[PDB]
Amino acid sequence: LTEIEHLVQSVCKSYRETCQLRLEDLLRQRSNIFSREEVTGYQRKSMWEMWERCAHHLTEAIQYVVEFAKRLSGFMELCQNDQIVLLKAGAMEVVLVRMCRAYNADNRTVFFEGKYGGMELFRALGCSELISSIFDFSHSLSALHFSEDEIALYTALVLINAHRPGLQEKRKVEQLQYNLELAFHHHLHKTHRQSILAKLPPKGKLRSLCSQHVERLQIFQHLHPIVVQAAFPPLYKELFS
Ligand SMILES: Cc1cc2c(s1)c(-c1ccc(C(=O)O)cc1)nn2C(=O)c1c(Cl)cccc1Cl
């Protein structure tokens, strides 16, 4: 009954209601690998069809990270300008981090559209360098054997960062940040997992992986606009034009 144990519980609950797939399912399907015939059917698809499918997954992924944020104790109580600043800087960073649950270190494959496949699945997109950076990142984290609670509390801190430029109420954002930071270290202490703090990616590795990812996604949307199931107008306004 400390406000801090309540926060851990309300963070982990929000994550559980928004994580799309259960970790038991992802681990049960690791033997369910795309065959050579199935990979080739993906390789043979138009760049722009692969772009449609991925644009769909990544949009859905963003919207689940938004709902995650809207269920974090204190988020809803911030002002709209600050909510949007945090989601604009952070929502896809969280998406990149969430992906590691779907990543199998042993064969270097990712759960995509029902089965596990290697980076060669996405050859028709032509962003071999970005896709290779996304696998490497996911590898780094998957080695750490990130647990559901560690992802939940870490991603919350990815979002609630009071150093994001353009916040109006810096002190209100600092109070949540401090509380979530305490939630995280408290948990890592109770689980003898403080050892991961030294192994996390630097803030810089994730910022730049994400800004290129968004850059590429923005170039695709310019060349080949997708139709988005827009749920959150203030944020969608900042990313589409
Ligand atoms: C920090 C953020 C990056 C980013 C966000 S937020 C959203 C998004 C999505 C939906 C809504 C909504 O209202 O439903 C709002 C925002 N898309 N997106 C992308 O990079 C993106 C994607 Cl995933 C697909 C295609 C093109 C692009 Cl540019």
Residue numbers in the entry: 267 to 507
The article reads:
Nuclear receptors (NRs) are a family of ligand‐dependent transcription factors that constitute an important class of drug target. Within this family, the retinoic acid‐related orphan receptor gamma t (RORγt) has garnered much attention as an intervention point to treat autoimmune diseases such as multiple sclerosis, psoriasis and inflammatory bowel disease. RORγt plays a key role in Th17 cell differentiation.
To now unambiguously confirm the binding mode of compound 13, we determined the structure of the 13‐RORγt binary complex using protein X‐ray crystallography. Of specific and notable interest is the folding of helix 12, in a conformation precluding coactivator binding. The binding mode of 13 to RORγt is comparable to that of MRL‐871. A first notable difference in the binding to RORγt of both ligands lies in the increased bulk of compound 13 toward helix 4 of RORγt, resulting from the methyl substituent on the thienopyrazole core. In particular, F498 changes conformation and thereby flips away from helix 4.
